[PDB]
Structures are given as C-alpha cells and as structure tokens.
Amino acid sequence: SVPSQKTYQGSYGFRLGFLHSGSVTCTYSPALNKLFCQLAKTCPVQLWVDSTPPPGTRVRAMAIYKQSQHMTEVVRRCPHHERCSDSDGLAPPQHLIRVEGNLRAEYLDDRNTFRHSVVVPCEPPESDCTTIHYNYMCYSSCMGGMNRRPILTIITLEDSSGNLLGRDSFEVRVCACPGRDRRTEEENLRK
Ligand SMILES: *c1nc(F)c(C#N)cc1F
Ligand SMILES: *c1nc(F)c(C#N)cc1F
Ligand SMILES: *c1nc(F)c(C#N)cc1F
Ligand SMILES: *c1nc(F)c(C#N)cc1F
Ligand SMILES: [Zn+2]
C-alpha cells in the first residue's frame, strides 16, 4: 500500500507554506519543493486555508520514500536512533516525524499498513497562518533506516473520521549542513 501524494486544496483551500531562510538549522527550497534540516531541530511549517474547516478537523504528517522502488517500505527511524533515550513522553521511539510543543499530538501505528504518522487538531490562526513545528529524528543517510534515500512528507487535512479534506507535500533531506546542501542541489538544478 502507498499513500497518495497528490496535491489537493479541497473545499477549504488547504496548502502549506514556508517562511524565508537562507548556521541555519532548516531551510526550504521552493525551486526543489524541498526542506533541508538538521537532526531533531524545529521545522516550522505554515498551514493556510481559505475557509475555516469544522471543529474536529485534524492535520496529519506522514513520511514516504520518494523513489517508486522504495515506496512500499515504511519510513522509520534507524536501529541506532530508535534506541536513543530521547522520548518526549509522547512520540514512540520508532517514529521519524515528531510534533513539538503540542500536547494534543497523537501518534499512529497503522494496524493495516504499519505506517507511522503524527496528527494534531487543526486550530484557527491567532494572524493569517497556523504554524506546526515538526522534528525529524533520523538523518537521511542513516544506514538501516532511510539509507540515503529521499523522502516526502505528506501533510493531510482530515475530518474527525480521518477522511481526506486536503493534501500537500514536500521533499525532506535531514543532514548536518542544510544550507550548503540546499545550495548544492539548487546549483545542480540550474546546471
Ligand atoms: C527552518 N526552516 C524553514 F524552512 C523556515 C522557514 N520559513 C524556518 C526555519 F527555522
Ligand atoms: C541518541 N540518543 C542520544 F542521547 C545521543 C546522545 N548523546 C545520541 C543518539 F544517537
Ligand atoms: C486548521 N484549522 C483551522 F481552523 C484553520 C483556520 N482558520 C486553519 C488550519 F490549518
Ligand atoms: C500563511 N500561511 C500560509 F501557509 C500561506 C500560504 N500558502 C500564507 C500565509 F499568509
Ligand atoms: Zn538514524
């Protein structure tokens, strides 16, 4: 089974956004639709809707491998990092993606597909945007985990039953030098 990655604004006009960045622990490339971040550092992601969704609407994040030959493999923390004593009290140690600073985050191990995801209630903005803070708890290069394979994060807006209301996505590289790696990959896209 493979989760869909098709962008879908839906009835509420749902989409993601990133603030600008160029020392950096996280930086987003619009040209590559790709977030570059350090291990276990805050990644702020903005959520936009055109219209306020109903109470009980939630926002779920899930990682999948980007390459088609790995898409059925569950993205999980590597054998090293899953044994770290780095629990926040809520995230199970196998989950790559955490939400920080939200006590209502729930973590799902899907009983059928075995995929991991983290979901929070969707709340109205303060402002014009809602921000969620994600952490990525493994490097892209971790052997026995992502093993240098690219991943996508899929962000879904869902009703209280889990039915799809909206979807957006971005590629992620978790690496020691996000600013340098962004500049290298944007230069490759240029040439
Ligand atoms: C890290 N990464 C980003 F993409 C942003 C933005 N916008 C902020 C940050 F700290
Ligand atoms: C996992 N957990 C830790 F606590 C450390 C340290 N120090 C490293 C690690 F990979
Ligand atoms: C989630 N939930 C909401 F209520 C809004 C609004 N308004 C945005 C969102 F991303
Ligand atoms: C705040 N948050 C967002 F996600 C967008 C977009 N797209 C715009 C905004 F002002
Ligand atoms: Zn790891």
Domains of the chain: 1-190 (2.60.40.720)
Protein residue with least CA distance to atom 8, ligand 2 = 84
Q: Is the dihedral of CA 91, 96, 99, 105 positive or negative?
A: negative
Phi, psi of 26 (to 5 degrees): -160, 140
With a CB cutoff of 8 Å and minimum separation 6, the contacts of 73 are 65
* Nearest atom of ligand 1 to the alpha carbon of 42: 10
How far away, in angstroms, is 123 Cα from ligand 3 center? 5
Contact between 126 and 46 under an 8 Å Cβ cutoff? The reply is no
For ligand 1, which residues put their CB under 6 angstroms from it? Answer: 18-21, 26-28, 35, 43-44
CA distance 178 to 9: 29
Q: Which ligand has its closest atom nearest to the C-alpha of 146?
A: 5
How far away, in angstroms, is 25 Cα from ligand 1 center? 8
DSSP H/E element including 35:
strand 34-37
Q: Per the annotation, does 138 bind a ligand?
A: yes
Site of tokens 């957006």: 168
Contact between 38 and 46 under an 8 Å Cβ cutoff? The reply is no
Protein residue with least CA distance to atom 6, ligand 4 = 17
> Resolution for this model in angstroms, one decimal place?
1.7
**CA distances for 123 relative to 58, 100, 185, angstroms:** 8, 15, 35
By CB neighbour count within 10 A (0-12 exposed, 13-18 middle, 19+ buried), where does 6 fall? exposed
- DSSP, collapsed to helix, strand or coil, labels residue 113 as coil
CA distance 191 to 176: 24
Protein residue with least CA distance to atom 3, ligand 1 = 27
β 106-109/130-136 pair status: unpaired
Confirm or reject: Cβ of 120 under 6 Å from ligand 4.
no
Confirm or reject: Cβ of 128 under 6 Å from ligand 4.
yes
Tokens of 171: 């590629």
Which experimental method was this entry solved with? X-ray
CA distance 106 to 155: 15
Phi, psi of 189 (to 5 degrees): -65, -35
Protein residue with least CA distance to atom 7, ligand 1 = 19
